[PDB]
Design a protein around this ligand. Sequence first.
Ligand SMILES: Cc1cc2nc3c(=O)[nH]c(=O)nc-3n(C[C@H](O)[C@H](O)[C@H](O)COP(=O)(O)O)c2cc1C
Ligand SMILES: Cc1cc2nc3c(=O)[nH]c(=O)nc-3n(C[C@H](O)[C@H](O)[C@H](O)COP(=O)(O)O)c2cc1C
Ligand SMILES: O=C(O)c1ccc2ccccc2c1
Ligand SMILES: O=C(O)c1ccc2ccccc2c1
Ligand SMILES: [K+]
Ligand SMILES: [K+]
Ligand SMILES: [K+]
Ligand SMILES: [K+]
Ligand SMILES: [Mn+2]
Ligand SMILES: [Mn+2]
Lengths: 496, 496
Amino acid sequence: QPAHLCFRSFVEALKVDNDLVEINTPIDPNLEAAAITRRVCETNDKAPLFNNLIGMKNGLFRILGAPGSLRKSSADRYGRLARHLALPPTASMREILDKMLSASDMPPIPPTIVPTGPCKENSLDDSEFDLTELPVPLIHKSDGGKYIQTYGMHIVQSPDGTWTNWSIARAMVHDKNHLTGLVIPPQHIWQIHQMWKKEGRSDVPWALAFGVPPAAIMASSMPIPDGVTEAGYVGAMTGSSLELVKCDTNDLYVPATSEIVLEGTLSISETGPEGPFGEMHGYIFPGDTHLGAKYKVNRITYRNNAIMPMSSCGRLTDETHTMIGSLAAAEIRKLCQQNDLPITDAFAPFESQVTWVALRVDTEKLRAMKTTSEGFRKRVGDVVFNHKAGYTIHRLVLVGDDIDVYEGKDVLWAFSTRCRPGMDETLFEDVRGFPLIPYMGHGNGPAHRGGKVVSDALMPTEYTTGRNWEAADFNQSYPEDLKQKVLDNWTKMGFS
Amino acid sequence: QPAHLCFRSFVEALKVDNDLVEINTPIDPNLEAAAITRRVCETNDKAPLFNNLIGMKNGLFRILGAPGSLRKSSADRYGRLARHLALPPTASMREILDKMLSASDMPPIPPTIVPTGPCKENSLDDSEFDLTELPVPLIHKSDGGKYIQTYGMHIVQSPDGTWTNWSIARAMVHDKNHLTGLVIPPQHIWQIHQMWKKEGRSDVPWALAFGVPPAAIMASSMPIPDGVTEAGYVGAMTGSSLELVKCDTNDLYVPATSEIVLEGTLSISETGPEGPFGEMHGYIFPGDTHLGAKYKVNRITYRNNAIMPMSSCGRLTDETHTMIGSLAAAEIRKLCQQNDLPITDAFAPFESQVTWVALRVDTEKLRAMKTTSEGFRKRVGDVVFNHKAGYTIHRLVLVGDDIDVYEGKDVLWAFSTRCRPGMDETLFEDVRGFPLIPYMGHGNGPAHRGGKVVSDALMPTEYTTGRNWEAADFNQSYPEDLKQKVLDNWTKMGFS
Ligand SMILES: Cc1cc2nc3c(=O)[nH]c(=O)nc-3n(C[C@H](O)[C@H](O)[C@H](O)COP(=O)(O)O)c2cc1C
Ligand SMILES: Cc1cc2nc3c(=O)[nH]c(=O)nc-3n(C[C@H](O)[C@H](O)[C@H](O)COP(=O)(O)O)c2cc1C
Ligand SMILES: O=C(O)c1ccc2ccccc2c1
Ligand SMILES: O=C(O)c1ccc2ccccc2c1
Ligand SMILES: [K+]
Ligand SMILES: [K+]
Ligand SMILES: [K+]
Ligand SMILES: [K+]
Ligand SMILES: [Mn+2]
Ligand SMILES: [Mn+2]
């Protein structure tokens, strides 16, 4: 089965790519696996596969770190992401994001139910497992718990059965048969929880599947629209109906080749201590413990030789940057276009810790709008910051046709030189804010509201008559014939 | 004579360092030399020495490009700058800026007058030279003239003789015996021009010396205080009195080993067409011609085999970044400390196109101030943005003790995660602005006023009780013994 549709096949693809290091000597899930993984992410090294984890009992479990992190080379920088999607490993970010958006104007391809799959090879009932006795990693030294859940798929369904949501949200072990985790607005796991709580009859039937089909974990990380079942969107994106098997203890369906499946309920009443956690912006606030949602685990099923994927998240560059940022930016691009805004491309620069999105403007179309910076800034911010796709993003940077938004250097150059602080910006204080950003949840202002800005790095004539500068760079400040002569004579003259 | 005190010796030092490429085949000063230089700066290659310039007549002239640009290696990244100052080529930016600040609390060492020097080897009077017949470079394809002056030293003196200023300011050829250039407030060449214009008696006696002592061109690029004679400050910084020779046609003094000396006057009445020019922020606005100051050239003296230094300025990274930004930041650091602000370090991040300065705060001292973000932001901005040293800088970023301001990645991380847009910022609209920044001179607002901001990336507890986070990075989120094990076993496990 293909790498994009089967996690076990994806691990083999990383091996064949020489993009894996198999560590067959004992590694401690208490910090060591995540430390190795963290160093990998900070240095764009090969993904580590920990085949010998201290505390692995009855096939639970191996760990793959850095499943969606970057490669060292520019030529296949995004190759792990490309391996999630059946794309060539040399795929550009534009090509990855266009693949992730391709299902947005296709009919869903609903999933196919099969009677069994590898995820049923082993099972443990409510008398046979203890989540405190599994080799769950301690990812950061001050974490408030062992974070079993960084790269699995929560599966919850609306009470009426019409929407089944797949998403990533963190969770840690609370006791032998419970997790706690973040369930916050406006996330779809929270929207669905709210539906069950207002019905008031029962806890939310739930499953958490780890090592799901790579194309499914990408959609799990993407803010596709409210009410859209991720299974059908991944089906349309891949052109293949996903095979799912029923859970043993509830009527939800999990990917048939899931490495590890937890079945149980998400409580509509109970909470427990959650966090702190070393998070995507690069911080942990030690002893910052809050109350989180509480999950009850009734059953575990798993593959022989099961592999748990793990994100050791924090400072650049890991899955919280390459997937959270980039996939939000893709949905923002589409959202702007659907609102008749002349946006061609969007990307969350890694240098902004994926708190900015750079929006490339088709300035020919902008000129035909006969508008102004203040007006256009206001319109773009109202569209993006009042939508769920804009949740994690606190600064939008508008740039003209000459900027490649996928090149952080060029975004920073445009931002720094074409946007006058204050005058070329509009602040948004009455929009939902992302509290995980330290200046929000641990800052001077409301944790959940405001602190957003649209920064216009379009120059004045981009709205009227056209770009009125040339860059003072090799590309733009010299004629073609000269540039080519210089390049052709470069090593002859003595340069490197 | 030592490399820091003699430009010819500095060129030999770059050769011996394997940091030079001598191009002995003919190179066109019309764009080709500057294109090669531009590519060098964009790729941190070796400095080009053009020994065979098309149009060189009677020893005028060779060109050295990229005299203060970066080297490829991290280990000697700033080695060219270190060669300006007698520092080891492995010098850090902190060490370079501390050397440039060292004269600020020393008695000046006045210059020594000598009767002759290499700069008198050749001369051309008012009947013998034609500036349009020299191989003056066209640096960018849309420049409004041939910019003879990018890395020479203007020498002007107050009418009362008590202050002699050395500075870099651009100038281009106007006709056979005149230049035009930018003379703008608050620059010292402009302050002195104003003194002569209010006296009203005569044009300003002037000289422009190219290929001056490297330590002297660094001070020329630094905003040392009003009324301070750069010669005495370089003397104190180097511990050696600079040897100067009198001009032939006026009573100014030039460095004895100057490669090329123009003598004449800066007009208190005349102007001429100046620019456009490909400038430090990375832009040219073609046909943007303004009126500039007008210089009359009465005499040229020069060394046998004279070498003209040239900055091919624009996008990263050249002398307009490494010297303008860094030397402003050094003077800002000192200015803050003199105003009892607890600043330890300052640097202008290259990623900001040197329009930001990051200020590292001693947060133990900050806590003893018992102050707030708004108050402290306001105080720092009032100090820096109402002083000449803050002129080119439009954003200040305040960061705590954990940030290395010399590491752009860490500044961007702190800025992006610890400064809430709007709430944690103070805008300054009633301060002098830098019109060369495109969002100023070609923007939506007043070209010369406002558009400045203090961005506070100090977290709330940095003002009260102390940092209350750990980074989610390899360094901070794992214990020492574990980190060292991981590093010691890194190649054994299979990593690069
Ligand atoms: C490694 C990783 C960790 C994540 N952690 C969280 C988290 O703890 N909580 C959260 O709400 N979203 C988290 N996300 C992001 C969500 O997956 C993303 O916002 C997605 O759009 C949610 O799905 P939904 O649109 O169906 O709600 C994470 C994503 C990744 C790649
Ligand atoms: C390559 C280069 C080009 C420069 N061009 C200019 C310029 O055209 N005009 C200007 O006023 N300053 C220019 N500067 C900056 C000044 O040298 C700097 O602001 C210095 O502080 C001026 O000296 P002063 O403090 O004695 O006025 C340049 C510096 C460098 C390194
Ligand atoms: O509970 C977090 O660490 C976290 C991380 C990333 C997140 C991304 C989008 C929404 C919520 C998020 C929460
Ligand atoms: O006339 C410019 O291109 C220019 C370049 C750098 C400058 C630096 C400080 C002050 C003025 C400046 C002017
Ligand atoms: K999703
Ligand atoms: K703008
Ligand atoms: K100076
Ligand atoms: K702050
Ligand atoms: Mn969803
Ligand atoms: Mn001066």
